[PDB]
Amino acid sequence: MLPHGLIVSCQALPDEPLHSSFIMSKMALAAYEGGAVGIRANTKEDILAIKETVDLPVIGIVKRDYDHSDVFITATSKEVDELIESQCEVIALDATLQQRPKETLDELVSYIRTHAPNVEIMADIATVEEAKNAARLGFDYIGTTLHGYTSYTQGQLLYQNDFQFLKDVLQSVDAKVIAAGNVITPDMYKRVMDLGVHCSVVGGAITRPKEITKRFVQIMED
Amino acid sequence: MLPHGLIVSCQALPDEPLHSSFIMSKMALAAYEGGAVGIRANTKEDILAIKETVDLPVIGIVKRDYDHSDVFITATSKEVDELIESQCEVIALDATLQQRPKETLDELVSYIRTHAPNVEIMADIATVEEAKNAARLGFDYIGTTLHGYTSYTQGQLLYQNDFQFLKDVLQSVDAKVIAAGNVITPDMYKRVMDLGVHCSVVGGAITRPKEITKRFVQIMED
Ligand SMILES: [Cl-]
Ligand SMILES: [Cl-]
């Protein structure tokens, strides 16, 4: 099971500067040496590289776009099969009620429990309605990952109104909640942990130097 | 000449997770895409990789330890010759009063002006008196890099007492001053720029995921 604490997301999609299974493995090493309790990573190849540098538990996804669907985080059983091959400890997937390319969400959850019975699952949700559905489905972890990153949550960011969205998720489910998406400072990490999340995912504020650089430059441009 | 704005330091010494000319070149590309106006980098191999990736001006150093000297930033003519070969726009060196392994500081400044007449020089100092000495020696830039990192500045850190050390350096010299060392947050960057530095170096807060991770974990351990 994931410990309480900091999960570092070590992702770099094609055309991002640090795109490389190799490079993400050394980023995960840095996160381990700095006190992370877990890693979140994208694609079987990055997961397998990370598993050669660190023994931290990994939350795996596969970001892959499909025609005629906006679902791109572990959309179908093809992505699930890649993640079962990766041997990541937690399989995360979009758990929105958006139209998927192939299996429905219920079917994908059933598929994972059948084919990978020793692997925990994490729901990436955008609304309280989705979070409560994920708890019904027996997800091990419910994350706020897609809040602000769907067409129906545009402009909403996790930290808005003193993390009201997170407070609403925590009140709505008894499952382990993960604060993920727009946790960008140590002060925000402390806030979400104080509100009672199991653990938090921090990505860009540690592993996207372009994103961090933009925050430094922007302070001079306000 | 260096512009005003943000210089991102892209360093990873041999024991660090990201040690790699290729990775530091991608850190530098990320910094460029985020709005940096220059790069600081360590070793000829890293600098050459960076300069083939981005056209930003580079402040070059060579960190190399020598017996019976506490000087390790561009300590001798060996390191200067490596930086001349690198074609970096600005050669930075320890500009402390500490005895060097080979050539004195004054010796190395004259050596750079005669062997690389088109290259600007940056003084990494620890004290106001070293800042004044570097102005005497005709440095183009004077940085606060070693303030708090010498045996005669122990316990001192740039940000202490609302950046009083920086205010004292700016009052003491007419040359372009660079805020470098312990510029940890966008708020610190804004403060030093508002106090009148030419530009500021930010390294580990952008390009050392281990140190950023450590800052997230620490907030929970206070
Ligand atoms: Cl990046
Ligand atoms: Cl690091």
Q: Kindly give, in sequence order, each residue whose CB lies less than 8 Å from that of residue A18, ignoring residues fewer than 6 positions away.
A: A12, A24, A27, A207, A208, A209, B23, B26, B27, B30
The number of C-alpha atoms within 13 Å of A48 and in the hemisphere containing its C-beta is 8
Q: Which of A216, A217, A222 to mutate to test the interface with B (most CBs of B within 10 A)?
A: A216
Minimal Cα–Cα distance from B125 to chain A, Å? 24
Which residue pairs from A112-116 have beta carbons closer than 8 angstroms and sit at least 24 positions apart in sequence? A112/A80, A112/A84, A113/A138, A115/A80, A115/A81, A115/A84, A116/A80, A116/A84, A116/A91
Positive or negative, the Cα torsion across A92, A98, A103, A108?
positive
How far is CA A128 from each of CA A98, A143, B80, rounded to the nearest angstrom?
Answer: 14, 11, 60
Question: Whose CA is closest to B215, among A158, A26, A36, A17?
Answer: A36
Coil, strand or helix at A193 = helix
Q: Which residue has the tokens 């970001």?
A: A63
DSSP assigned state of A3: P
> What's the CA gap between B92 and B150, in Å, rounded?
17
> What's the CA gap between B113 and B209, in Å, rounded?
37
The number of C-alpha atoms within 13 Å of A191 and in the hemisphere containing its C-beta is 17
Residues of B in contact with A39 (CB under 8 A): none
Q: Which residues surround ligand 1, an ion (CB under 5 A)?
A: A 17, 208-210; B 30
How far is CA A1 from each of CA A120, A141, A178, A179, rounded to the nearest angstrom?
Answer: 8, 10, 13, 16
CA of A189 to the centre of ligand 2 (A): 20
Structure tokens at B211: 């140190």
CA of A41 to the centre of ligand 1 (A): 15
Looking at domain A5-219, its CATH class is alpha beta
DSSP assigned state of A73: B
Positive or negative, the Cα torsion across A190, A137, A76, A3?
positive
Coil, strand or helix at B200 = strand
Q: Which of A9, A183, A212, A214 to mutate to test the interface with B (most CBs of B within 10 A)?
A: A212
The number of C-alpha atoms within 13 Å of A118 and in the hemisphere containing its C-beta is 5
Residues of A near B (CB-CB distance < 8 A)?
5-6, 8, 17-18, 20, 23, 26-27, 29-31, 33-36, 186-187, 189-190, 193, 202, 205-220
